[PDB]
């Protein structure tokens, strides 16, 4: 039994801390409006979604991204209070954060014990998946740029070790044209556009099949493709005949 007037939320049957439907609220003592966003209460930082519900998690304030923690995580903190959390990673569900000396979450590129990570500027959450950053293509897992062949919006790119091609940054997709790539014990072939080819291919008189999901040549034994079984050698070359 509450009402929302002109994007401002009020509850009747009210000011201060209110538990409603299990979810926690703080209606401003003066305006009776439900607090939204970063909110200071008794010198203690809290954070509410746009709907007024208090949150546990990592959210941006005027001093950067803060950790709004469950009860009794640090000192005797109240549920939802921002806490001191220094020089370490935080793992919340499948999200990863790195917290600095001033208990704020890292954003952008950061070097942690000699390893480089990228944390999304808008969430502080460890990057995952294809990303374009200052016109450079990266493919992230758990905040770490991956090396290998991964599928982006324009097909499979070669995300390479530093200085593979004219000083590319570590994990940056590079130009890599009309040639085989032998990488993870895996075999790939790259066309003129620097994308890995998939499917059946004839290259230098030999037949190959590059798996659609990974772009790796079928290699090292028996494979089923199109409902039948083929043998592919150690070099990815299809043997004669079909079983």
């Amino acid at each position: 039994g509450m009402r929302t007037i002109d994007g401002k939320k009020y509850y009747f049957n009210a000011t201060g801390w209110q538990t409603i439907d299990g979810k926690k609220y703080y209606f401003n003592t003066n305006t009776s409006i439900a607090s939204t966003g970063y909110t200071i209460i008794n010198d203690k930082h809290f954070y509410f979604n746009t709907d007024g519900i208090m949150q546990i998690g990592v959210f941006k304030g005027p001093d950067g991204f803060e950790y709004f923690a469950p009860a009794n995580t640090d000192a005797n903190n109240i549920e939802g209070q921002a806490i001191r959390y220094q020089n370490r990673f935080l793992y919340l569900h499948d999200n990863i954060y790195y917290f600095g000396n001033n208990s704020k979450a890292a954003t952008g590129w950061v070097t942690i014990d000699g390893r480089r990570y990228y944390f999304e500027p808008n969430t502080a959450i460890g990057a995952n998946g294809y990303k374009i950053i200052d016109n450079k293509n990266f493919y992230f897992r758990n905040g770490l740029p991956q090396i290998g062949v991964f599928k982006g919006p324009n097909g499979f790119e070669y995300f390479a070790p530093a200085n593979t091609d004219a000083n590319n940054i570590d994990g940056q997709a590079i130009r890599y044209q009309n040639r085989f790539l032998h990488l993870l014990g895996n075999i790939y072939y790259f066309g003129n556009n620097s994308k890995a080819v998939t499917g059946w291919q004839t290259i230098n008189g030999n037949m190959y099949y590059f798996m659609p999901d990974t772009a790796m040549a079928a290699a090292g034994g028996l494979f089923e493709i199109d409902g039948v079984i083929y043998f592919f050698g150690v070099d990815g070359v299809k043997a004669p005949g079909i079983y």
Partner: nanobody, 123 residues
Framework: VKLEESGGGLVQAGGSLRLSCAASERTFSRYPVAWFRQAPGAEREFVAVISSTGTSTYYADSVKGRFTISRDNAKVTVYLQMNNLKREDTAVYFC?????????????????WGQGTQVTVSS
């Protein structure tokens, strides 16, 4: 995919058995299906594989000519006909699906397995 093997048991050398591997879902028919066998103490050794369609097969050398792998996708079932059985054929037999369709002889590449059925060849 859930798989259930049946048809094993005790048998005299030179005899025969037909093993069955039944699934519960039609999606079975999308994937190649293999038999592996495990003797006590030993590792799961490859026996035969059949393609999703049933038109393409491959057998280990030791069973070639004696065993025949087949399937009936209407009954969502794969069969292994085992003729002229030998003492060396004694083992638990498992059927397995390889949904990635890669490296069909390698048991590690198979993600769905039956519970197994015992085959024991006497004298």
């Amino acid at each position: 995919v859930k798989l259930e093997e049946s048809g094993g048991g005790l048998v005299q050398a030179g005899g025969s058995l037909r093993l069955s591997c039944a699934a519960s879902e039609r999606t079975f028919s999308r994937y190649p299906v293999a038999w592996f066998r495990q003797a006590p103490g030993a590792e799961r050794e490859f026996v035969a594989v059949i393609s999703s369609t049933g038109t393409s097969t491959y057998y280990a050398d030791s069973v070639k000519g004696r065993f025949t792998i087949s399937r009936d996708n209407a009954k969502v079932t794969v069969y292994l006909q085992m003729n002229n059985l030998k003492r060396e054929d004694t083992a638990v037999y498992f059927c397995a699906v390889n949904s990635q369709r890669t490296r069909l002889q390698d048991p590690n590449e198979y993600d769905y397995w039956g519970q197994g059925t015992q085959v024991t060849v006497s004298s």
